RNA sequence: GGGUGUCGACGGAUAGACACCC
RNA sequence: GGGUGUCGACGGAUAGACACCC
């Protein structure tokens, strides 16, 4: 676990091919943008488990 | 860019070896937790540019 | 046009949808 | 004990630090 703090409108990074941007917040919601090549996957934690379980939307 | 929305206390995922967690907010700050192996790097956008420019802090 | 909260979404979009207030 | 804003940090920690108000 590595915690960081970020004001809305700033950015964060992962690996050498991924970037993240805190687009903003509302109440307790947070718009979080991600920038990665389709060479890698990105999903919510409630969806990531499904890409690993047998799929339901291949195409 | 792939935007997502998350209430504080929930999570998101990247690749097959990284996880993210919206630990919370404060004013306009956002505590963001990250969980990845030391086999890969993770930093702020104001620090990532430095791991790509030069350093001496590593082992 | 602005503010606030909530929602929906394997969505790759600096994205949307709804309600309330000015 | 509670609320709010800000700060610091290549830090791998559900992490810290400060100020204001009750």
Automatic annotation (TrEMBL), chains A, B:
SUPFAM superfamilies: CsrA-like (SSF117130). Signal peptide: none annotated. Keywords: Activator, Cytoplasm, Repressor, RNA-binding, Translation regulation. The keyword RNA-binding applies. Pfam families: CsrA (PF02599). The keyword Cytoplasm applies. Coiled coil: none annotated. It is found in: Cytoplasm. One of its GO terms (molecular function) is mRNA 5'-UTR binding. GO terms for cellular component: cytosol. One of its GO terms (biological process) is positive regulation of translational initiation. A key translational regulator that binds mRNA to regulate translation initiation and/or mRNA stability. Mediates global changes in gene expression, shifting from rapid growth to stress survival by linking envelope stress, the stringent response and the catabolite repression systems. Usually binds in the 5'-UTR; binding at or near the Shine-Dalgarno sequence prevents ribosome-binding, repressing translation, binding elsewhere in the 5'-UTR can activate translation and/or stabilize the mRNA. Its function is antagonized by small RNA(s). Belongs to the CsrA/RsmA family. PANTHER family: CARBON STORAGE REGULATOR (PTHR34984). Homodimer; the beta-strands of each monomer intercalate to form a hydrophobic core, while the alpha-helices form wings that extend away from the core. This is Translational regulator CsrA.
């Amino acid at each position: 676990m590595l915690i960081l703090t970020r004001k809305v409108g700033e950015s964060i990074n992962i690996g050498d091919d991924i970037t993240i941007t805190i687009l903003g917040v509302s109440g307790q919601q947070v718009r979080i943008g991600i920038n990665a090549p389709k060479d890698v996957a990105v999903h919510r934690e409630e969806i990531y488990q499904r890409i690993q379980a047998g799929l339901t939307a291949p195409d």
